[PDB]
Structure formats: structure tokens, C-alpha cells
């Protein structure tokens, strides 16, 4: 799957019991954002951490 540079995670959701992340690819516009299965980002901890924060500081 070629593999591409990840800029950040935009949001998350669950489809059934599985976790998915909407990804913003570095160098690409939002027209290229895709929902990816969690396992695809597990080794992108800098990115996962920055998303956990963004959501914690927004929790109303």
C-alpha cells in the first residue's frame, strides 16, 4: 500500500467494535482524507498522542 507520510488524525469512530481514524496525509488536501483501521497508526505515537490531547482539551 505504498505507505505515506501522516500529518495528523482528524477524528475517530467505531464501526461495530472496531476503531477507525480519519487521516490527513502530509502534502495532501482534505479531499484525500481517508478512514483507516487503527492498526495502521499504532506505530505513529506522536500522532496518536496529539489527537488524544486535542480531544481532552475539548471535552465539554
Amino acid at each position: 500500500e505504498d505507505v505515506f507520510e501522516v500529518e495528523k488524525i482528524l477524528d475517530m469512530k467505531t464501526e461495530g467494535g472496531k476503531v477507525l481514524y480519519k487521516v490527513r496525509w502530509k502534502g495532501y488536501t482534505s479531499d484525500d482524507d481517508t478512514w483507516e483501521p487503527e492498526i495502521h497508526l499504532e506505530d505513529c505515537k506522536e500522532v496518536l498522542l496529539e489527537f488524544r490531547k486535542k480531544i481532552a482539551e475539548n471535552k465539554a
Binding site: 505504498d2 505507505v3 487521516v23 495502521h40 506505530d43
Partner: peptide, 12 residues
């Protein structure tokens, strides 16, 4: 040593 920074794209 820094994280992967990359990921595969199945969503294409």
C-alpha cells in the same frame, strides 16, 4: 530515534 510517522493507506 523517532516514531514511524508513516502509515499504509487502505482507504485509498
Amino acid at each position: 530515534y523517532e516514531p514511524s510517522t508513516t502509515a499504509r493507506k487502505v482507504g485509498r
